[PDB]
Amino acid sequence: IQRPPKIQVYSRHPPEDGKPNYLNCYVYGFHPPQIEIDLLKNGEKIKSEQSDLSFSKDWSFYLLSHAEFTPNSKDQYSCRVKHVTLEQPRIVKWDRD
Amino acid sequence: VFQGPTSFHLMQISTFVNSTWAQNQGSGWLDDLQIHGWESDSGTAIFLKPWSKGNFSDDEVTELVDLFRAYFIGFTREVQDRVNEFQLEYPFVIQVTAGCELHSGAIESSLRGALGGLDFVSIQNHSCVPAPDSGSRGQKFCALTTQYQGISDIIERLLSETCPRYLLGVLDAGKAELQRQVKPEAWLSSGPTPGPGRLLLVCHVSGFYPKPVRVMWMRGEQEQPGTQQGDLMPNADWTWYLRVTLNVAAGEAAGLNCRVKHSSLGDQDIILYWH
Numbered sequence: 001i002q003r004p005p006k007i008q009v010y011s012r013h014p015p016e017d018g019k020p021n022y023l024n025c026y027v028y029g030f031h032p033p034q035i036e037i038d039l040l041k042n043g044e045k046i047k048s049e050q051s052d053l054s055f056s057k058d059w060s061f062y063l064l065s066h067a068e069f070t071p072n073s074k075d076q077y078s079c080r081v082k083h084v085t086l087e088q089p090r091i092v093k094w095d096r097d
Numbered sequence: 098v099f100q101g102p103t104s105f106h107l108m109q110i111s112t113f114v115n116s117t118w119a120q121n122q123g124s125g126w127l128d129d130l131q132i133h134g135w136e137s138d139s140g141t142a143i144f145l146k147p148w149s150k151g152n153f154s155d156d157e158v159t160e161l162v163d164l165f166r167a168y169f170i171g172f173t174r175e176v177q178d179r180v181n182e183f184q185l186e187y188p189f190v191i192q193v194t195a196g197c198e199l200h201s202g203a204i205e206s207s208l209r210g211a212l213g214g215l216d217f218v219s220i221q222n223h224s225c226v227p228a229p230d231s232g233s234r235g236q237k238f239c240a241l242t243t244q245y246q247g248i249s250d251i252i253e254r255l256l257s258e259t260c261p262r263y264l265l266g267v268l269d270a271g272k273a274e275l276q277r278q279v280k281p282e283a284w285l286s287s288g289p290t291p292g293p294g295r296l297l298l299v300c301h302v303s304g305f306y307p308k309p310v311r312v313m314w315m316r317g318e319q320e321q322p323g324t325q326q327g328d329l330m331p332n333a334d335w336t337w338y339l340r341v342t343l344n345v346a347a348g349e350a351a352g353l354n355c356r357v358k359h360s361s362l363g364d365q366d367i368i369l370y371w372h
C-alpha cells in the first residue's frame with residue numbers, strides 16, 4: 001500500500017531574529033520509504049542532516065531533517081519533499097507563527 | 098511513574114527493487130530513541146551512546162553483530178530466490194521489528210514482520226502466527242519457518258534469553274541519561290488566519306524530556322474544549338516538540354493562557370498568557 005508523506009516544519013528553540021537556532025522538517029506517515037527531503041533558504045538548498053530511516057507501530061516511515069539557521073524578518077525558509085505519490089515536489093514553508 | 102523507555106527493538110527495512118537490487122537498512126532503538134546504527138555494506142554496527150552495549154561484553158556484542166551481518170546476507174538471498182514461490186512482485190518492502198518490553202511486575206518478546214506496509218506475521222513463544230489478513234502466503238511462510246528450525250531457534254533464543262538480559266542491562270547502563278529531566282521551552286504565536294474574526298492561537302512546547310507532557314489552553318481554570326493536540330514531533334537532541342492550537346474569536350482571546358505540565362517541573366506548571 002502507498003501512503004503520502006506528511007510534513008511539519010518547526011524550530012528547535014523560540015525564534016528570535018538574528019539568533020542561531022535549528023530548523024526541523026519532520027516527514028512521516030509515508031510508504032514506500034524512498035524519499036527526497038531538502039530544507040530550503042529562499043527556495044534554495046542549505047546543508048542539512050537527516051536521521052536514519054525508521055517507522056511507526058503501523059509500519060509507516062518517518063524521517064527528521066534538520067539544519068542550523070538564523071531567522072530574520074527578511075529570509076524565508078521551507079522544506080521540499082519528493083515522493084512517488086507526489087505529482088510535483090511538495091513545499092511546506094516554515095511559518096514561524 | 099517509571100521514567101524513560103521500556104522497550105528495545107532491532108529494526109529492519111529491506112527494499113527489493115529487482116532481481117539484482119536489494120537494500121537493507123538496520124538499527125537499534127529504545128522506544129523511539131536510536132541507540133544503534135548499522136553500516137550495510139560491511140555489516141558494521143554503530144554505537145551511538147556511551148552505554149549502547151549495556152552490560153554486554155565486547156565479545157558478546159561482536160558475536161551478535163556477526164550474527165546480524167550473516168542474517169542480512171541470508172535474508173536477502175532467500176527472499177530473492179523465493180520471489181516466484183510467494184508471488185511477490187517488484188518493487189517490494191519488507192519491514193521487521195524484533196525485541197522485548199517491560200511490563201510492571203515479566204518481560205514480553207516478539208518479532209513482527211510486515212509486507213507492502215501491512216501486518217504479515219508475528220513470531221512469539223516458539224510459534225509463528227500469520228496476520229489475519231496475510232492469506233495463504235502467510236500460512237506458507239509460517240510452514241516455511243518450521244523447515245528452518247536452526248534459524249528459528251536462534252531467533253527464539255534472541256527473543257527470550259538475550260533480549261530480556263540486554264534490555265535490563267542497557268536501561269541500567271544509560272539510566273542517568275534515560276531518566277534525566279529536561280524542562281520545556283514554551284512560546285505562543287498566532288498562526289495563519291483561519292477565518293473572519295478568528296485567531297489561531299498556537300502554544301509551542303519544545304525541548305522537554307521525557308516524552309509524556311500535557312499542554313492545554315485555559316481561561317482561568319476552565320480547560321478550553323476547542324484545544325487541538327498536535328502530534329509529538331522529534332527534535333535532533335532526544336527531546337520533543339509539540340504544537341497545541343486554539344481556534345478562537347478575536348474578541349475572546351483576552352484572558353486565555355496555555356498551561357504546560359511536565360515531570361521536570363514538579364507540581365508547578367509553566368503558564369503563558371496571550372495578549
Ligand SMILES: *[C@@H]1O[C@H](CO[C@@H]2O[C@@H](C)[C@@H](O)[C@@H](O)[C@@H]2O)[C@@H](O[C@@H]2O[C@H](CO)[C@@H](O[C@@H]3O[C@H](CO)[C@@H](O)[C@H](O[C@H]4O[C@H](CO)[C@@H](O)[C@H](O)[C@@H]4O)[C@@H]3O)[C@H](O)[C@H]2NC(C)=O)[C@H](O[C@@H]2O[C@@H](C)[C@@H](O)[C@@H](O)[C@@H]2O)[C@H]1NC(C)=O
Nearest residue numbers: 152153154157204258260261262263265266267268269270
Ligand atoms: C546484564 O543484566 C541482566 C539483568 O540483571 C538485572 O539487572 C541488572 C542491571 C542488575 O541490577 C542485576 O542485579 C539484575 O539481576 C543480567 O541477567 C540477570 O542475572 C541475574 C543474576 O545476577 C538473574 O537472576 C537470577 O535468577 C536465577 C534464576 O532462577 C536465580 O537462581 C538467582 O537467584 C539467586 O541469586 C540471588 C542473588 O542475585 C539471590 O537473591 C537468591 O537468593 C538466589 O540465590 C538470580 O535471581 C536474572 O534472571 C537475569 N535476568 C534476566 C532478565 O535474564 C545479566 O547477567 C547474566 O545473565 C544471567 C542470565 C546469568 O547468566 C548471570 O550470571 C549473567 O551474568 C547481565 N548480562 C551480562 C552479559 O552481564
Ligand SMILES: CCCCCCCC/C=C\CCCCCCCC(=O)O[C@@H](COC(=O)CCCCCCCCCCCCCCCCC)COP(=O)([O-])OCC[N+](C)(C)C
Nearest residue numbers: 107109123124125133142163167168171172175195210251
Ligand atoms: C547491534 C546493532 C543493531 C543492528 C540492526 C540489526 C537489524 C536486524 C533486525 C531484525 C532481525 C532480527 C533477527 C535476526 C536474527 C539472526 C538470524 C540468523 O540466525 O542468521 C542466519 C540467517 O540466514 C537466513 O537464511 C535468514 C532467514 C530469513 C528467511 C526469509 C525468507 C522468506 C521469504 C518469503 C517472503 C515473505 C514476506 C516476509 C515477511 C517478513 C518476515 C521476516 C545465518 O547465521 P549463521 O549461523 O550463518 O552465522 C554465522 C556468522 N557469519 C556467517 C557471519 C560468520
Ligand SMILES: *[C@@H]1O[C@H](CO)[C@@H](O)[C@H](O)[C@H]1NC(C)=O
Nearest residue numbers: 113114115116117118119187
Ligand atoms: C535493476 O535496477 C538497477 C537500478 O537500481 C538497474 O540498473 C538495472 O538495469 C535494473 N534491472 C535489472 C534487470 O537488473
